[PDB]
Design a protein around this ligand. Structure first.
Ligand SMILES: *[C@@H]1O[C@H](CO)[C@@H](O[C@@H]2O[C@H](CO)[C@@H](O)[C@H](O)[C@H]2NC(C)=O)[C@H](O)[C@H]1NC(C)=O
Ligand SMILES: *[C@@H]1O[C@H](CO)[C@@H](O[C@@H]2O[C@H](CO)[C@@H](O)[C@H](O)[C@H]2NC(C)=O)[C@H](O)[C@H]1NC(C)=O
Ligand SMILES: [Cl-]
Ligand SMILES: [Cu+2]
Ligand SMILES: [Cu+2]
Ligand SMILES: [Cu+2]
Ligand SMILES: [Cu+2]
Length: 497
């Protein structure tokens, strides 16, 4: 079952074996992935997070972010550790109490402390629309139509050795899949459909790192939502999905009753499908309980290309139709060297006092805010442009902005900008060497909003900045509950800070 919008959520340690290999994990709701948190557009979510963690090898503190939800007036509830709160300590709980006005779509939640989400704290978050403009395109849309794609590691996140390459050991689809090495025939996930019906498949990348080439043998996929944003219908036969992105697609169960491979090929780790790695099963009702015998094509006919997507609504693009045509046009220098990422020459290291708390205590320009050089102010009620030119090692980097979605004025692998009708989304691949992926948004949400690469290993290695949006109105716009005020004193006492 789905939980919420008002629910408890316990964070525990447990052993799991999603690929047949046992290891300890950090779990929400006792499962990997965690349970789906759900409600309707405009609902009040009250998610009381109980930190019950005891194993220090995966950190006993936690903080949870609700990825893609704007948190307008509730910046304190956003979750990034040392940006909007101090972590919750073990044996304590915290009520994330917020509203989702004006949003409906497919989201997710994840730890936002260190690389802890990699250790298991990740799950879907769905905001249904009772008046969804896409409702008539499908018949079924429920917990059974959510598809999560996850990377899974045998080595614990905190135990990844300095100086060695990090790659995953299995791809998990709906929490199950097979290991790339020492493969065993552990159970695969099954997604069941009924011949003749149409399904809103909610595809969620909960990856810590790889992008996936997602496909379903014999089928094609009609995209109707991108990172929470309704799109015009776009039919594809493969979707390259980067870490933290979401799509809804219509799956028409229009093939013969049978079994079809679901494929998710990561860009690193195991290549191909030998032994059933990188795989799940689409099973029609009435099919034999056996593995598919289908193949992929050598070449896909209609892969997703981001510039092909367009909003369903007339969203346009803010600003003027040329580079720099914004109130606050930025170009970030995104770099990597010697194990650390930087933005404009500064590698992100979380501060002792959360950015939001520094603001509430009276720091009132970004030069006053710590970490020095990692916080950039944005003016209120302004069009912002951020160019994100690629080139830094470890690409393609999926960049994500908290508190906002954005128009993707320029996409990967295409030098032409689009000031008319590009998709809006919240996580975008910045592409490859020489690209100039560029985003736009308007500043109508006071508070400190994290901008970072969503490859969690890169975030940990510094690939982030904080946009302190409308510093002057942050305090008035974001009244804080006592429990939030209590977080840092409890954390600092527990940690002898
Ligand atoms: C990406 O686009 C930005 C503008 O959005 C370019 O920024 C300009 O950079 C030149 C020097 O490279 C400066 O003289 C300008 O002041 C910048 N802003 C402009 C023209 O609007 C940036 O060069 C582009 N990067 C790449 C790698 O193509
Ligand atoms: C590269 O990106 C541009 C801009 O998004 C794409 O150009 C648009 O193409 C569509 C489809 O033919 C036209 O309706 C628009 O008028 C174009 N807009 C602009 C500003 O040129 C282009 O198709 C993309 N290239 C590829 C190969 O997909
Ligand atoms: Cl977000
Ligand atoms: Cu986010
Ligand atoms: Cu995120
Ligand atoms: Cu990255
Ligand atoms: Cu984030």
């Amino acid at each position: 079952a789905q939980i919420g919008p008002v629910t408890d959520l316990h964070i525990t340690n447990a052993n799991i074996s999603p690929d047949g290999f046992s290891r300890p994990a950090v779990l929400a709701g006792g499962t990997f992935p965690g349970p789906t948190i759900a409600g309707n557009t405009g609902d009040n979510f009250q998610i009381t997070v109980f930190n019950d963690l005891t194993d220090p090898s995966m950190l006993t503190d936690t903080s949870i972010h609700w990825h893609g939800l704007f948190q307008k007036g509730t910046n304190w509830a956003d979750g990034p550790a040392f940006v909007t709160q101090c972590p919750i300590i073990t044996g304590q709980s915290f009520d994330y109490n917020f509203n989702v006005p004006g949003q409906a779509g497919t989201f997710w939640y994840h730890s936002h402390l260190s690389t802890q989400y990699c250790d298991g704290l990740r799950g879907p978050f769905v905001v249904y629309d009772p008046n969804d403009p896409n409702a008539s395109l499908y018949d079924v849309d429920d917990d059974t139509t959510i598809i999560t794609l996850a990377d899974w590691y045998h080595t614990l996140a905190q135990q990844e050795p300095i100086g060695a390459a990090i790659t995953a050991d299995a791809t998990l689809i709906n929490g199950l899949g097979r290991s790339f090495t020492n493969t065993t025939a552990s159970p695969l996930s099954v997604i069941t459909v009924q011949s003749g019906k149409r399904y809103r498949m909610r595809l969620v990348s909960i990856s810590c790192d790889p992008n996936y080439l997602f496909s379903i043998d014999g089928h094609d996929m009609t995209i109707i939502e991108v990172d929470g944003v309704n799109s015009q219908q776009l039919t594809v036969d493969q979707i390259q999905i980067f870490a933290a992105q979401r799509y809804s697609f219509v799956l028409n169960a229009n093939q013969p009753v049978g079994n079809y491979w679901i494929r998710a090929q990561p860009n690193s780790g195991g290549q191909g499908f030998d032994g059933g790695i990188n795989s799940a099963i689409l099973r029609y009702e009435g099919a034999t309980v056996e593995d598919p015998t289908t193949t992929a094509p050598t070449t896909f006919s209609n892969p997703l290309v981001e510039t092909d997507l367009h909003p369903l609504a007339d969203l346009g693009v803010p600003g003027q139709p040329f580079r720099g045509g914004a109130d606050d046009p930025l170009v970030l220098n995104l770099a990597f060297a010697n194990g650390r990422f930087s933005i404009d020459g500064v590698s992100f290291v979380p501060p002792t006092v959360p950015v939001l708390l520094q603001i509430l205590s009276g720091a009132q320009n970004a030069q006053d805010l710590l970490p020095a050089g990692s916080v950039i102010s944005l003016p209120s009620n302004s069009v912002i442009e951020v160019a994100l030119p690629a080139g830094a090692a470890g690409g393609p980097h999926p960049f994500h902005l908290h508190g906002h979605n954005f128009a993707v004025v320029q996409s990967a692998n295409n030098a032409t900008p689009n000031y008319v009708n590009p998709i809006w989304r919240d996580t975008v691949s910045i592409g490859g060497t020489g690209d100039n992926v560029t985003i736009r948004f308007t500043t109508n949400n006071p508070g400190p909003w994290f901008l970072h690469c969503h490859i969690d290993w890169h975030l940990e290695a510094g690939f982030a900045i904080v946009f302190a949006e409308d510093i002057p109105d942050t305090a008035s716009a974001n009244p804080v509950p006592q429990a939030w005020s209590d977080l840092c004193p409890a954390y600092d006492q527990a940690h002898n800070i």
